[PDB]
């Protein structure tokens, strides 16, 4: 029922993810971010259904955002889990690049390596309105 899911890393991406939420809602999108819209019940189900329900998966690539996905053999890391769901479901994946270094794909789990083939949007501190505009152009 939301159009946009926001996947982010708390310890480096929380503030950016929130700013993305606020801007997109301003522009008429219904947005899921965990802190606003993850409510009662077993969260493993709710989180994954929430990815499945949104056309758009916006992924915040703050510095090191994918480091916990590395060597996540049992799929216990939540950004890992969200990306796989977005990939499996063929979502409109929009990476947002905020000081991220592109790792060699093979440091990532096979089931999320394809995340790096989607075109991302550089988050510009100096030109935020234009960044926001570009993100809206990408959204389906």
Ligand X SMILES: CN(C(=O)N[C@@H]1COCC1(F)F)[C@@H](COc1ccccc1)c1cc[n+]([C@@H]2O[C@H](COP(=O)(O)OP(=O)(O)OC[C@H]3O[C@@H](n4cnc5c(N)ncnc54)[C@H](O)[C@@H]3O)[C@@H](O)[C@H]2O)cc1
Is residue 15 part of the contact set for a copy of itself (CB under 8 A)? yes
Is residue 66 part of the contact set for ligand X (CB under 6 A)? no
Nearest distance from C-beta of residue 78 to ligand X, angstroms: 3
Between 83 and 132, CB nearer to ligand X = 83
d(CA 71, CA 107): 8
Is residue 80 part of the contact set for ligand X (CB under 6 A)? no
Is residue 137 part of the contact set for a copy of itself (CB under 8 A)? no
Residue ranges that bind ligand X, judged by CB under 6 A: 7-11, 34-35, 38, 43, 47, 68, 78-79, 82, 126
User: Which residues are catalytically annotated?
Assistant: 82
Residues placed in the known binding site for NAD(+): 9-10, 39
Residues placed in the known binding site: 9-10, 39
């Amino acid at each position: 029922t939301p159009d946009v899911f926001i996947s982010y890393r708390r310890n480096s991406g929380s503030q950016l993810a929130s700013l993305l939420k606020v801007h997109l809602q301003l522009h008429g999108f219904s947005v899921f971010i965990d802190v606003e819209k993850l409510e009662a019940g077993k969260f493993e189900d709710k989180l994954i259904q929430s990815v499945m329900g949104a056309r758009n998966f916006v992924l915040v690539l703050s510095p090191g955002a994918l480091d916990k996905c590395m060597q996540d053999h049992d799929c216990k890391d939540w950004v890992h889990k969200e990306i796989v769901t977005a990939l499996s479901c063929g979502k409109n994946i929009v990476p947002i690049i905020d000081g991220f270094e592109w790792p060699e794909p093979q440091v990532l789990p096979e089931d999320m390596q394809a995340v790096l083939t989607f075109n991302g949007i550089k988050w510009s501190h100096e030109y935020q309105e234009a960044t926001i505009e570009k993100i809206i152009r990408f959204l389906q």
